[PDB]
Amino acid sequence: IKIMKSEVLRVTHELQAMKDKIKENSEKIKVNKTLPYLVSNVIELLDVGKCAVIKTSTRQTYFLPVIGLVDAEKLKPGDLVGVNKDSYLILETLPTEYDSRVKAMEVDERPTEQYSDIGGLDKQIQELVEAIVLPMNHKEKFENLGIQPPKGVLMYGPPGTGKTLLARACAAQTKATFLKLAGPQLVQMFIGDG
Amino acid sequence: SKMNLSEEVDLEDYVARPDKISGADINSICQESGMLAVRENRYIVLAKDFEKAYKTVIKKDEQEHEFYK
Amino acid sequence: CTKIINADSEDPKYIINVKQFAKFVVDLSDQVAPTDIEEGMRVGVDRN
Amino acid sequence: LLEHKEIDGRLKELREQLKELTKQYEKSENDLKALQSVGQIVGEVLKQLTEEKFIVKATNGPRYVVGCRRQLDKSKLKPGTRVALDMTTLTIMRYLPREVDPLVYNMSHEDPGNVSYSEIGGLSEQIRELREVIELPLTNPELFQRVGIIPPKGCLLYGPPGTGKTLLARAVASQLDCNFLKVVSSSIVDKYIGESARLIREMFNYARDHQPCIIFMDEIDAIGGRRFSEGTSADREIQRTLMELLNQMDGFDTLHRVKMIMATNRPDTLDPALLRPGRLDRKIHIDLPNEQARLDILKIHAGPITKHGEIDYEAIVKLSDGFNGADLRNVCTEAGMFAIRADHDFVVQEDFMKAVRKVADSKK
Ligand SMILES: Nc1ncnc2c1ncn2[C@@H]1O[C@H](COP(=O)(O)OP(=O)(O)O)[C@@H](O)[C@H]1O
Ligand SMILES: Nc1ncnc2c1ncn2[C@@H]1O[C@H](COP(=O)(O)OP(=O)(O)O)[C@@H](O)[C@H]1O
């Protein structure tokens, strides 16, 4: 029973010392990972065990055998990364960026409706609720049936009959992000609005 | 030439049939012959699968309404 | 300057687009404070 | 057992759980060897001046004459091969696979969904034929080599929309478990004059780089169209694209282990050169299902739906003529939807009747 006690003593000495060496490693890590990072747009990830090519914001395209000091699993092909100013290693990843039209595609997250704004469409809003939010909260009862929930509702009617208002009302009652994609605008803008 | 032996099929008569078929169509006829031979599991082509390949390739289906001609 | 990247004294970093040179992600200076720096105004960054 | 209760009362925690910080040291070591890296300039080799001096052009930058690493396969560093350069000494550090076009990337990295062959139904002759023409060269090429033919390069599946040509090709890809480019024609056309043909070139270059591969181009009726004179700028641009597709299939550079599947609803308008053999060696009629095919589609698509008591298919078959396959799957899905209007956890036969009735009315 003595040898395991000696092993406990030696392992606690090893722990006590390699705590200090791991802290020294952290200090040197920060000595490289200091502060003035340079943002780059990850073009793609390549397998070698993953390598990524990047386009730094200084209009230069570089290859990385190892993915910096950050994880390398999500690493979306387009995720902005803070790469080293000189050795160009990915110190850390940053939040995403605007994609032009989507920023132009206003959210208007608070549509401020309570179904007291829409009137005369009681059957219509009941159908909308039962088609979108009722399956949303009883998706369990849906997979019990072994069928998939409806992935999208459709409406039709003469212009100015409240089709957009009901959409805003559903967005309000579900607190769901609203995007007002246009219909006649998309037919133009050249080939590419697909 | 690279094909298997054709067990004495009338290749000269197949040639003699008047049909506006290009060299690509002849290559297709031979390729179809090989496919049919593989499908029915026999390595030596004969007149049956060669003929079926010929009909398949040069089908030239028209169905055109009779009033045109 | 650009997105504040949730500084809140825990991530005092911002995306800044140095004209045609490049974009970078930089900290503050002892002179400046977080309050007067937000998105979109003209930020005078150093050269090192 | 005096001090050996479980293990010494203290080793139980010291041996492994307080050795998690050894795995943290391992993480720190990975960080260290990532620190030591410096990254590499990437460019494309342009020419082989001699056994060592290579002309290399860096992307969006200047070109250099550079050497290569001591241990490297020089015999493969062909002109145009994307390569990596050391940032300081500017030597060929390592090779890179050819850069993939972003639209080609998104078109190639779509999951087929590993759909089995059972989920097609009523296509036995056509599925057997396409299985032959595509997969037989991909499984036993020596059989074709012995028989005396070159493996056919691809085929066409024509039929009414909803007949499952896309499904059949998607299933072929899943069975083969090979690279699969699922592109839709009329989505590769571009306003810019020379971009659609370039996209076709990039598609086939990826296909050659990633053998074995099956390019499924849907709606080939879009790009492929009897080339005709006159024509607006667009008409001609599409001809130019068809001309690239043609040369990229049967052209000077022979295709290998890259089998194409093309689906269309209007085979009659396809160009005779495209319709000629060599490029599309087979034309497959995926026609509207017969009664047997219809009942097969219903039975294979009624699987996931939970049935109680009695569910027959021949009645739906004789009462649902004209439905291709999508209409029948719609019938099944609409029956599942009908199931929760009256709040069942199952389906009934009258439910299937009213579902197919609604689907038929929508068909009208
Ligand atoms: N039933 C209704 N109750 C109250 N307002 C309505 C109703 N129907 C339409 N509106 C008014 O019409 C406008 C919405 O028109 P809508 O039909 O949604 O637009 P569009 O036809 O362009 O899609 C809103 O200003 C809304 O107040
Ligand atoms: N044998 C079949 N024929 C036709 N459609 C089918 C068949 N089996 C299943 N389907 C249904 O048809 C859909 C396939 O659509 P798709 O392949 O795009 O048709 P198309 O090839 O005519 O465009 C699937 O969602 C599936 O539910």
Beta carbons of D132 and B34 less than 8 Å apart:
no
Task: Using the structure block, give the residue that is written with the tokens 């390598």.
Answer: A51
How many H helices and E strands in chain C? 0, 2
DSSP state of D244: H
Atom number of ligand 1 nearest to Cα A117: 4
Return the partners of chain C (3 or more C-beta pairs < 8 Å): A
Q: Which residues pair with D41 in a beta bridge?
A: A62, D85
- The dihedral region occupied by D261, where left means phi > 0, alpha psi between -120 and 50, and beta the remainder, is beta
Q: Do chains D and A touch (3 or more CB pairs under 8 A)?
A: yes
Beta carbons of B34 and D276 less than 8 Å apart:
no
Task: Select from D129, D172, D151, D164 the least CA-distant residue to D283.
Answer: D129
Closest residue to D149, CB basis, from B22, B34, B39: B34
Set of chain A residues whose Cβ sits within 8 Å of the Cβ of D21:
15, 18-19, 22
- Check CB contact of A41 with chain C, cutoff 8 Å: no
- Which residue is closest to D278 within chain B, CA to CA? B24
- Which residue is closest to D144 within chain B, CA to CA? B34
Helix, strand or coil, per DSSP, at residue D294? helix
**Cα D223 from Cα D136, distance rounded (Å):** 28
Set of chain A residues whose Cβ sits within 8 Å of the Cβ of C6:
95
Please answer whether residues A178 and A111 qualify as being in contact, where contact means their C-beta atoms are separated by less than 8 angstroms: yes
Ligand 1 pocket by C-beta < 6 Å: which residues? Answer: A 118-121, 159-165
3-state helix, strand, coil in chain D (%, to 5): 45, 15, 40
Please answer whether residues A70 and A93 qualify as being in contact, where contact means their C-beta atoms are separated by less than 8 angstroms: yes
Please count the other Cβ atoms lying within 10 Å of the Cβ belonging to residue D200. Answer: 26
* Å from CA of D162 to ligand 2 middle: 5
Q: Which residues contact A174 (CB under 8 A, 6 or more apart)?
A: A132, A133, A136
Spell out the SS3 assignment of A114-155. CCCCCCCCHHHHHHHHHHHHHHHHCHHHHHHCCCCCCCCCCC
Helix, strand or coil, per DSSP, at residue A95? coil
**Cα D23 from Cα D39, distance rounded (Å):** 26
Report, in angstroms and rounded to the nearest whole number, the Rg of chain B calculated over CA atoms: 14
Helix (H) or strand (E) holding D98: none
Residue A101, token pair as written in the block? 């039209």
Please answer whether residues D136 and D150 qualify as being in contact, where contact means their C-beta atoms are separated by less than 8 angstroms: no
**Structure solved using which method?**
cryo-EM
What angle separates helix D195-209 from helix D233-249, to the nearest 10 degrees? 20
- Count CA atoms closer than 13 A to B53's CA, side-chain side: 24
Beta carbons of C24 and A36 less than 8 Å apart:
yes
Residue D62 preceded by cis peptide, ω within 30:
no
Helix (H) or strand (E) holding A44: strand A37-47
Burial category of A191 from C-beta neighbours within 10 Å (exposed 0-12, middle 13-18, buried 19 and up): middle
- Check CB contact of C15 with chain A, cutoff 8 Å: yes
Which ligand is the nearest neighbour of the Cα of D324? 2
Q: Binding site for ATP: which residues of D?
A: 159-166
Nearest CA to ligand 1 atom 11: A162
Please answer whether residues C3 and C37 qualify as being in contact, where contact means their C-beta atoms are separated by less than 8 angstroms: no
Q: Which of B38, B43, B56 to mutate to test the interface with D (most CBs of D within 10 A)?
A: B38
Distances (CA, A) of A125 to A141, A169, C25, D197: 22, 9, 48, 48
**Cα D145 from Cα D137, distance rounded (Å):** 9
DSSP string, D141-183: HHHHHHHT-PPP-EEEEE-STTSSHHHHHHHHHHHHT-EEEEE
Please count the other Cβ atoms lying within 10 Å of the Cβ belonging to residue A152. Answer: 7
Please answer whether residues D360 and D320 qualify as being in contact, where contact means their C-beta atoms are separated by less than 8 angstroms: yes
Closest residue to A8, CB basis, from D11, D99, D305: D11
Torsion on CA atoms A163, A167, A168, A174, rounded to nearest 10: 160
Helix, strand or coil, per DSSP, at residue D292? helix
Q: Do chains C and D touch (3 or more CB pairs under 8 A)?
A: no
CA D309 to chain centre: 41
Q: Which residues pair with C26 in a beta bridge?
A: C14
**Cα D203 from Cα A149, distance rounded (Å):** 35
β pairing state of D154-158 and D258-264: parallel
**Cα A173 from Cα D35, distance rounded (Å):** 51
> How close is the nearest chain B Cα to the Cα of D278, in Å?
6
**Cα D213 from Cα D181, distance rounded (Å):** 8
Burial category of A190 from C-beta neighbours within 10 Å (exposed 0-12, middle 13-18, buried 19 and up): exposed
Helix, strand or coil, per DSSP, at residue D99? coil
In total, chain C counts a number of residues equal to: 48
- Check CB contact of A37 with chain C, cutoff 8 Å: yes
CA angle B3, B7, B11 (to 5 degrees): 70
Beta carbons of C24 and A35 less than 8 Å apart:
no
Q: Which residues contact B45 (CB under 8 A, 6 or more apart)?
A: B3, B4, B6, B7, B9, B33, B34, B36, B37
- Phi, psi of A138, deg, nearest 5: -105, 45
- Check CB contact of B36 with chain D, cutoff 8 Å: no
Please count the other Cβ atoms lying within 10 Å of the Cβ belonging to residue A140. Answer: 7
With a 6 Å cutoff on the Cβ, whether D325 touches ligand 2 is: yes
Task: Select from D307, D197, D193 the least CA-distant residue to D244.
Answer: D197
Task: Select from D161, D169, D271, D281 the least CA-distant residue to D221.
Answer: D271
Please answer whether residues D316 and D332 qualify as being in contact, where contact means their C-beta atoms are separated by less than 8 angstroms: no
**Cα D134 from Cα D172, distance rounded (Å):** 8
Residue B56, token pair as written in the block? 């398949």
Burial category of D90 from C-beta neighbours within 10 Å (exposed 0-12, middle 13-18, buried 19 and up): middle
